[PDB]
Amino acid sequence: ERFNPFSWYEEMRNTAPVQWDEERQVWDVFHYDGVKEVLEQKNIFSSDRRPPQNQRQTALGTSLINIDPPKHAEMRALVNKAFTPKAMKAWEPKIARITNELLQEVEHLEDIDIVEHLSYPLPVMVIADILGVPIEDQRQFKDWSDIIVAGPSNNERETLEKLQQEKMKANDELETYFYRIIEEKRTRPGDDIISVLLQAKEEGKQLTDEEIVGFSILLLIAGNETTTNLISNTIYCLMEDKASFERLKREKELLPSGIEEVLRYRSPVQALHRIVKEDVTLAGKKLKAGEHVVPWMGSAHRDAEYFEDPEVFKIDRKPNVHMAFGRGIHFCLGAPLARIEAKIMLAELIDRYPQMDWSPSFELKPIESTFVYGLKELLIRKNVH
Numbered sequence: 001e002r003f004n005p006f007s008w009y010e011e012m013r014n015t016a017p018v019q020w021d022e023e024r025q026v027w028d029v030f031h032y033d034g035v036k037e038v039l040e041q042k043n044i045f046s047s048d049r050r051p052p053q054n055q056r057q058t059a060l061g062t063s064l065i066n067i068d069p070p071k072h073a074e075m076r077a078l079v080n081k082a083f084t085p086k087a088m089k090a091w092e093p094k095i096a097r098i099t100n101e102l103l104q105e106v107e108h109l110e111d112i113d114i115v116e117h118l119s120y121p122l123p124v125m126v127i128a129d130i131l132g133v134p135i136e137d138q139r140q141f142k143d144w145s146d147i148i149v150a151g152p153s154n155n156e157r158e159t160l161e162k163l164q165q166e167k168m169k170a171n172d173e174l175e176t177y178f179y180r181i182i183e184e185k186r187t188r189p190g191d192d193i194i195s196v197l198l199q200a201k202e203e204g205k206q207l208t209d210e211e212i213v214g215f216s217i218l219l220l221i222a223g224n225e226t227t228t229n230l231i232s233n234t235i236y237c238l239m240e241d242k243a244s245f246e247r248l249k250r251e252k253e254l255l256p257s258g259i260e261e262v263l264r265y266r267s268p269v270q271a272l273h274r275i276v277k278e279d280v281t282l283a284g285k286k287l288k289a290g291e292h293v294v295p296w297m298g299s300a301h302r303d304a305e306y307f308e309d310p311e312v313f314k315i316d317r318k319p320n321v322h323m324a325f326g327r328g329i330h331f332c333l334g335a336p337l338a339r340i341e342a343k344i345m346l347a348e349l350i351d352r353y354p355q356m357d358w359s360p361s362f363e364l365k366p367i368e369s370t371f372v373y374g375l376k377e378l379l380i381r382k383n384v385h
């Protein structure tokens, strides 16, 4: 089964936590301390993925996640200015408003898809609003986003060509859309991320307009699918372990902790990419500059040295030092937003439909990916009828 890569991770942690894969041409790292070192050692393991000159120079390609220090620190210090607990005080009620708008549109249905009707849309709508995208543009904004992260319908040759073109169209349309917004918010600010990024300064430096376009597009990519899966996956866990659901209803203040345990147990992001910057040894393995490394946080999260009874879902787990948000200088700067978006949507669902259970029409349909762990649909019956 493809909703279970954890058997394979165990087999690999127990034989060769660091191993070369000859087909994929990468060093896999399955063991907690190894994943930890790959992400912490910025200077050994590089996040530089900027496209060569002969490839398309997208604003995303040189955005925060694809660069190293010293530039990464300059850029990080600036975008961090828009992700403070102070901005969150304004984001929360927008997120509750959107959560209730979405539940209201399916109030009339006994069975609902957690993915299509609630978790897929919620991040897209939130991030539009907090970016400063006006309401009159938000349907076109959802369309662009559906397209830039879509997969192909079938494996036919023409439909793959079509997708590849419509994605480049969307990236370049989005970029022009964002370039306009930046000018509009240049002379008429507002309380939105873009306006904040425009006014930010650090040691007398500022973000260019390209950098801001790139980071905006980045937030779309980084925060949409992942947050969707954190919610879907959390429902899935509670429907699997009814005991934990029942306990969660009786102790509401456990929810943040049970979300953290979904982050550990069914991590939206199973792995990352790094490139070796200098020869290094790792669990006795000689890694040579230029070779590619894939730390699997999903496996690290099942290492008993750091998580007792790792194969058990424990909504009160303590300690729970997952790296679902990475670790080190590239640590997810949206983790606070992902956490409250999951919390608000999931609290409301639990409050309204405590007898919730699998739709008898349910199907296990996992995303066809190894780096991304989540469901295409998650059919649920409310049992309020």
Ligand code: HEM
Binding pocket: 047, 064, 065, 066, 076, 127, 218, 219, 220, 222, 223, 224, 226, 227, 230, 267, 268, 269, 272, 273, 323, 324, 325, 326, 327, 329, 330, 331, 332, 333, 334, 335, 337, 338
């Ligand atoms: C459950 C939800 C999420 C998960 C599991 C997740 C996962 C991650 C991980 C693992 C990293 C480290 C990447 C690396 O080192 O290559 C990362 C970075 C990042 N994330 Fe998140 N993410 C989530 C939600 C979000 C949201 C909601 C946003 C923004 C709205 C966001 C924006 C970013 C950005 C901009 C970075 C790059 C930071 C840097 O390279 O300095 N993510 N994310």
